[PDB]
Amino acid sequence: PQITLWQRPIVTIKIGGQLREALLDTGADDTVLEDIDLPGRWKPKLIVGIGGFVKVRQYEQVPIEIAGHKVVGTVLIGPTPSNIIGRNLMTQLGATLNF
Amino acid sequence: PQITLWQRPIVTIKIGGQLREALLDTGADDTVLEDIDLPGRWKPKLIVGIGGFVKVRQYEQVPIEIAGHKVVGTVLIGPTPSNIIGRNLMTQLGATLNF
Numbered sequence: 220p221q222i223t224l225w226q227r228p229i230v231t232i233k234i235g236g237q238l239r240e241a242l243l244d245t246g247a248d249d250t251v252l253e254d255i256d257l258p259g260r261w262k263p264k265l266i267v268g269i270g271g272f273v274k275v276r277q278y279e280q281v282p283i284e285i286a287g288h289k290v291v292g293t294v295l296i297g298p299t300p301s302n303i304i305g306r307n308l309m310t311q312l313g314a315t316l317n318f
Numbered sequence: 319p320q321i322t323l324w325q326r327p328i329v330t331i332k333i334g335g336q337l338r339e340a341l342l343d344t345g346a347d348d349t350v351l352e353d354i355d356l357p358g359r360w361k362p363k364l365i366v367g368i369g370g371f372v373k374v375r376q377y378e379q380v381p382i383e384i385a386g387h388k389v390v391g392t393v394l395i396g397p398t399p400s401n402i403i404g405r406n407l408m409t410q411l412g413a414t415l416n417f
């Protein structure tokens with residue numbers, strides 16, 4: 220698609236057999252979701268944004284689908300005001316910013 | 319330009335007769351800079367990110383140049399780990415996310 224930016228750029232994703240929404244965020248290194256539980260082992264990871272830092276769970280080699288791209292990536296799980304898809308997954312979609 | 323997302327998408331901007339760098343952030347409603355002082359009146363504004371909220375100065379009708387685009391927009395000034403250009407200014411550049 221070609222997404223315009225007068226609205227927040229929200230997409231549907233599929234993760235752990237569940238449908239969620241998330242924000243395509245070029246200013247995010249990583250992907251953070253709050254409203255899913257992921258299975259298996261993880262490691263603590265610290266992330267930082269505009270409010271300060273937050274501790275999250277780093278789940279590796281997670282399968283995820285975004286438009287109809289089936290990619291595998293690190294997904295962080297923890298508190299965030301909005302689910303966000305970061306550059307770690309946007310690279311895999313071949314997404315670009317154009318102007 | 320077409321900007322790929324394997325790196326942080328950082329651009330040069332010109333604001334208050336000074337050159338700065340900032341991150342093109344589709345997950346930002348607003349534009350936030352920390353390393354410039356702007357002149358004149360402002361209004362308190364709260365912004366929210368990962369980690370929590372922060373109090374900033376809202377400066378209105380600020381002129382700013384991003385890649386030969388001379389736009390006027392709200393600029394927030396306050397603490398942030400990175401200067402960021404939000405959708406308020408990216409819309410004025412006709413910027414889109416494409417995949």
Ligand SMILES: CCCC[C@@H](CN[C@@H](CCCC)C(=O)N[C@@H](CCC(N)=O)C(=O)N[C@@H](CCCNC(N)=[NH2+])C(N)=O)NC(=O)[C@@H](NC(=O)[C@@H](NC(C)=O)[C@@H](C)O)[C@@H](C)CC
Nearest residue numbers: 246247248249266267268345346347348365366367399400
């Ligand atoms: C969660 C809700 C939206 C996502 C968020 C992402 N912004 C970037 C800002 C870039 C840093 C200033 C961010 O946190 N990125 C993180 C996300 C977490 C992540 N792990 O990816 C980041 O890459 N963190 C890296 C660190 C970047 C370090 N960068 C640096 N030092 N320059 C990391 N590994 O933790 N947007 C925001 O934080 C924006 N907020 C908004 O847009 C909100 N609107 C208002 C009006 O406040 C809306 C959420 O209600 C900000 C900028 C104010 C307009």
